[PDB]
Design an enzyme around this catalytic site. Structure first.
Site, PDB file in Angstrom:
ATOM      1  N   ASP B  35       0.867  -1.077  -0.069  1.00 38.44           N
ATOM      2  CA  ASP B  35      -0.024   0.125  -0.074  1.00 38.44           C
ATOM      3  C   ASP B  35       0.644   1.352   0.049  1.00 38.44           C
ATOM      4  OD1 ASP B  35      -2.000   1.673   0.604  1.00 38.44           O
ATOM      5  OD2 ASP B  35      -2.418   1.054   2.694  1.00 38.44           O
ATOM      6  N   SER B 199      -1.958  16.324 -12.030  1.00 41.20           N
ATOM      7  CA  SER B 199      -2.630  15.663 -13.207  1.00 41.20           C
ATOM      8  C   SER B 199      -3.083  16.828 -14.311  1.00 41.20           C
ATOM      9  CB  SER B 199      -3.657  14.476 -13.443  1.00 41.20           C
ATOM     10  OG  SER B 199      -3.838  14.129 -14.416  1.00 41.20           O
TER      11      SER B 199
END
Lengths: 8, 330
Positions: B35, B199
Site C-alpha cells: 500500500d 495531473s
C-alpha cells in the site's frame, strides 16, 4: 466486486 | 542491493494484489498487500483474536530468532473505507525479493476488522507511503522502503501491476525492458505524507483533451480511479445506460456496453487507461448491471489514482531527497 480503499 | 518481487492479483477483477514477504529467522513467508497510501507494515499474527482469523497465514513471532518485542509500543490504523487493524509491534528481519532489511518494525495485529477477516488471501499490509504516516506509539517507526533506501542502488521503487495477470515490484532500480518510450517524472508534494501529484488533464475516448489540474495520490492500496465529479460524469455520459445509483453507491453501466478509454495527463505525456480496465464486472452475481472503475472523489475529499490507472503505466516512486513520480507507457 470487492474493491479496496487502503489511510484515514 | 536490489530486489524484484512478483505481485499476483487475488481475484479475477484484480481488485487487490499480494506480494510474498519473508519475515523472521528462519523465514515465514506471508502474502502482503503493498500500500503506497499507508505507512504501516502489519501482519496477521499469533496474538490476533481467534474469531478474527479465518484462513490467513499467521506470523508466529515466538518462533523467529531475530524477533524481539518493542515494549510499551502500540499501533492503531484506520483506512479510507471503515477498515480497522491494531495491536503491538515487534522488531525483526523482512526480505522482499531478496532485499533484506534488519530490525524492521513488524506490527503484529491483536484486533483486526471484519473486512480483513473476510479477506483470506491477504496476510497483512506493507506501507510504501511516507513515514510521517506511521501509526506506532509512542515511538514512530519507518517503512521498508525507508529502512532499505540507504542500502539500495537507486532510492526508488517501481510499480508494474498487470491487467488480469501478475506483475512486479522492483526495489533499487528501473527495469528499462519493462516499458515503451520515455518516462515522464512529475513533482511530488510530500507534505501530507502521500505520493501526491498533479495531473495535467483528461480525455475520454477519442475526444479532445481537457487542461484542468487534478491533484491526486498514487495509491496501489485502492482498487478504483477516484476523480472529481465533473470529470467522472463527463466520462459516464459517453456510455449509454450508465447512471449513478444510491444503493450501489456509484456509477454502473449495463454489461453489454463498450467502455471507452480514459486518458490522464502526466506533464506533457498521455497515459491511456483502456476501456477494458474500467469494467469491474456485475454488481451482484447474475446481474446485467456492471460496476464501473471511475468513481467520484466527492465523498472522500481526495482524488486517488488507484489500481485502475496505475496498472495502465509503469510507475516509478523516486524516494530521493526531492521525490518525483514517473509514469511510462507499457
Amino acid at each position: 466486486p470487492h474493491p479496496f480503499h487502503x489511510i484515514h | 542491493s536490489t530486489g524484484s518481487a512478483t505481485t499476483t492479483p487475488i481475484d479475477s477483477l484484480d481488485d487487490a494484489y499480494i506480494t510474498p514477504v519473508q519475515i523472521g529467522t528462519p523465514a515465514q513467508t506471508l502474502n502482503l498487500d503493498f500500500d503506497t497510501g499507508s505507512s504501516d507494515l502489519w501482519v496477521f499474527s499469533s496474538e490476533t483474536t481467534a474469531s478474527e482469523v479465518d484462513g490467513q497465514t499467521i506470523y508466529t513471532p515466538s518462533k523467529s530468532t531475530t524477533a524481539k518485542l518493542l515494549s510499551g509500543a502500540t499501533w492503531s490504523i484506520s483506512y479510507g473505507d471503515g477498515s480497522s487493524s491494531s495491536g503491538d509491534v515487534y522488531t525483526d528481519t523482512v526480505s522482499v525479493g531478496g532485499l533484506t532489511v534488519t530490525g524492521q518494525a513488524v506490527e503484529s495485529a491483536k484486533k483486526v476488522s471484519s473486512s480483513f477477516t473476510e479477506d483470506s488471501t491477504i496476510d497483512g499490509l506493507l506501507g510504501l507511503a511516507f513515514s510521517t504516516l506511521n501509526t506506532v506509539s509512542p515511538t514512530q517507526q519507518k517503512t521498508f522502503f525507508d529502512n532499505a533506501k540507504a542500502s539500495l542502488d537507486s532510492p526508488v521503487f517501481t510499480a508494474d501491476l498487470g491487467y488480469h495477470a501478475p506483475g512486479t515490484y522492483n526495489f533499487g532500480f528501473i527495469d528499462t525492458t519493462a516499458y515503451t518510450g520515455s518516462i515522464t517524472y512529475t513533482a511530488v508534494s510530500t507534505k501530507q505524507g502521500f505520493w501526491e501529484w498533479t495531473s495535467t488533464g483528461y480525455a475520454v475516448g477519442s475526444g479532445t483533451f481537457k487542461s484542468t489540474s487534478i491533484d491526486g495520490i498514487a495509491d496501489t492500496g485502492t482498487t478504483l480511479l477516484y476523480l472529481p465529479a465533473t470529470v467522472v460524469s463527463a466520462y459516464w455520459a459517453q456510455v449509454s445506460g450508465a447512471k449513478s445509483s444510491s444503493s450501489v453507491g456509484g456509477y454502473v453501466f449495463p454489461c453489454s456496453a463498450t467502455l471507452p478509454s480514459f486518458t490522464f495527463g502526466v506533464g506533457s505525456a498521455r497515459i491511456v487507461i483502456p476501456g477494458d480496465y474500467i469494467d469491474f464486472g456485475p454488481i451482484s452475481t447474475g446481474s446485467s448491471s456492471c460496476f464501473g472503475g471511475i468513481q467520484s472523489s466527492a465523498g472522500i475529499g481526495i482524488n486517488i489514482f488507484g489500481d485502475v490507472a496505475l496498472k495502465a503505466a509503469f510507475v516509478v516512486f523516486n524516494g530521493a531527497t526531492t521525490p518525483t513520480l514517473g509514469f511510462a507507457s507499457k
